[PDB]
Design a protein around this ligand. Structure first.
Ligand SMILES: O=P(O)(O)C(O)(Cc1cccnc1)P(=O)(O)O
Ligand SMILES: O=P(O)(O)C(O)(Cc1cccnc1)P(=O)(O)O
Ligand SMILES: [Mg+2]
Ligand SMILES: [Mg+2]
Ligand SMILES: [Mg+2]
Ligand SMILES: [Mg+2]
Ligand SMILES: [Mg+2]
Ligand SMILES: [Mg+2]
Lengths: 338, 338
């Protein structure tokens, strides 16, 4: 389980920071990297990184879980957390967000600003530094490099689809379709958040078969679709004290699950209300959209969807888990379905 | 030679774009990637990419230069041009630049803005897409992946040093030292612009020895230091019709070679003039700094430096080229020393 390993995982971060921040000439730049790592890779729930560690423990025979192999698993879990930190620092600039993980976004900090672009790229570079230091002699080293590089390309293509569908200052209700939505979230979130951590543990355990990885992907990309729908729902209806951040999807004209569901149910009067108020900074326009979503009972539509989704994901675990332990996927379902 | 291969190299770009932009769901995002590739990876001199191709031709026996091997060399040269495009798109946002390669910077284009952050990352992702498609079965594949990843980390650490030394709105004359300068440019420019293209050709030719790569690096990082000093000089004294871009180093408070040389020669009255006018947006303050640099004959100091640098780099070619053909380094010296 995760809940137990959260403190244990977090305890390994100080060694990750020490190995990355140990040529005195670059000293000031290494001090800045330490500040970027400390600010941006801590404060989250660490679900993606913990997934690597728990899945590795469940997939590798305990007699093979020696100290060095376990250290490699913790390090690769932290690599997944560094990839997410890279995407979030940059996403927060592109989405004009204000807070993340209970504090001001890194780019909004006085003295940081758009220098955060380079800081995000340093976080991504740290992944490959750690893989070389800890994993270069292992038979799965190239599989992991390619998996992290593919996950980044996937995510970036999905970010392009997200940003193209959400132009600033242009109405884009015509592209807020279920088909467009499923394509955005599959690429921007599902691959790196669900497939990547389990696939990394699979490769570290010697499970490199195409069929085995395709079957796990069938479960995991559907779980990732639900995780992004829940993120969209919480952007507006979650409590920032719990989520750690303030939502921006309506002001940012995003193809959110909520707006997709709104358009499917709206009358022509409601469609016009959404056209006139969506995608704009004015607080009273944002409030009108939320009031429309409440008039259409979209919170009840989301709860029903969550139930139907959970049943679908469990049916996929029954179809596709074997020969992996079903616990690998059940523990991940427990973290996302609250 | 380069001058001949410029059109031949450019002719391969259409196949690079076709293989990268060939799942209809992501179609709109792939169309945007094609626009980012067309806008940002064309218009330059292609010196870094051509260096890969010319060095490969000079290092590999002609009987081994079959069509497929030559295609791999063109593709890896284009990978170096994609790395430079990634760094330049992001650098232009962080340096608040206006033009590049004779047109408005990508981020300044109406409708692009900070979405250019994700576009820059897509350019970097394309490198690894091409290396996998064209080079995965080759014995040097992992050497090239690691070389591109190291070059990126080097460059990003140097960008951190550049940005830290150049705070907006704070005087930083105390850190504009020759020692700080040499450290910034070695990491931000010399590794990716000079070592990377020659080292990539070396690995493709089977030259993977640590000693051979260290000796080439001794020449190439010094040539890269001169290339950044020339870039700094041209930021203020070059003609934008020739350089393709407008300089921003004085307004951006940069640790430019020019300001370093100014501080070494300044009287106390001149130091105060530079303190009051450097690092600020006002056009009349920028003009005062340029007038001070002219009073101190910094253009003549740069020409003398260029002569002394060229003699030093040629002495290093005599010391360290062997057993590589000296032409590999002489052709690169000819491109940078005008
Ligand atoms: O955490 P956020 O900003 O709600 C988000 O989930 C962050 C994110 C960044 C990159 C890829 N996927 C999700 P978004 O998609 O912007 O709603
Ligand atoms: O082309 P530019 O902007 O003059 C530059 O050379 C671009 C650049 C970007 C990244 C690394 N090195 C040089 P800079 O260093 O900003 O002066
Ligand atoms: Mg966001
Ligand atoms: Mg986003
Ligand atoms: Mg969100
Ligand atoms: Mg610049
Ligand atoms: Mg710069
Ligand atoms: Mg410059």
């Amino acid at each position: 389980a995760y809940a137990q390993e959260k403190q244990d995982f977090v305890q390994h971060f100080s060694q990750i920071v020490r190995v990355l921040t140990e040529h005195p000439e670059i000293g000031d730049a290494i001090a800045r990297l330490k500040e970027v790592l400390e600010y941006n890779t801590i404060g989250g729930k660490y679900n993606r990184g913990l997934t690597v560690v728990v899945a590795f423990r469940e997939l590798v025979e305990p007699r093979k879980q020696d100290a060095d192999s376990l250290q490699r698993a913790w390090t690769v879990g932290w690599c997944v957390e560094l990839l997410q930190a890279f995407f979030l620092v940059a996403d927060d600039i592109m989405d004009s967000s204000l807070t993340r993980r209970g504090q001001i976004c890194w780019y909004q900090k006085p003295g940081v600003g758009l220098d955060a672009i380079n800081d995000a790229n340093l976080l991504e570079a740290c992944i490959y530094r750690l893989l070389k230091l800890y994993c270069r002699e292992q038979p799965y080293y190239l599989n992991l490099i390619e998996l992290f590089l593919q996950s980044s390309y996937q995510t970036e293509i999905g970010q392009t689809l997200d940003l193209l569908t959400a132009p600033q200052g242009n109405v884009d209700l015509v592209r807020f379709t279920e088909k467009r939505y499923k394509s955005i979230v599959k690429y921007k979130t599902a691959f790196y958040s669900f497939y990547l951590p389990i696939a990394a543990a699979m490769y570290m355990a010697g499970i490199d078969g195409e069929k085995e990885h395709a079957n796990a992907k069938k479960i995991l990309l559907e779980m990732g679709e639900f995780a992004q729908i829940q993120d969209d729902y919480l952007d507006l209806f979650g409590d920032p004290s719990v989520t750690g951040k303030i939502g921006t999807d309506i002001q940012d004209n995003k193809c959110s699950w909520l707006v997709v569901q709104c358009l499917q149910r709206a009358t022509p009067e409601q469609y016009q209300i959404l056209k006139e108020n969506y995608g704009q900074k004015e607080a009273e326009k944002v409030a009108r959209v939320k009031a429309l979503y409440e008039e259409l009972d979209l919170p009840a539509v989301f709860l029903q969807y969550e139930e139907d989704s959970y049943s679908h994901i469990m049916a996929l675990i029954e179809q596709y888990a074997a020969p992996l332990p079903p616990a690998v996927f059940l523990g991940l379902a427990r973290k996302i379905y609250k």
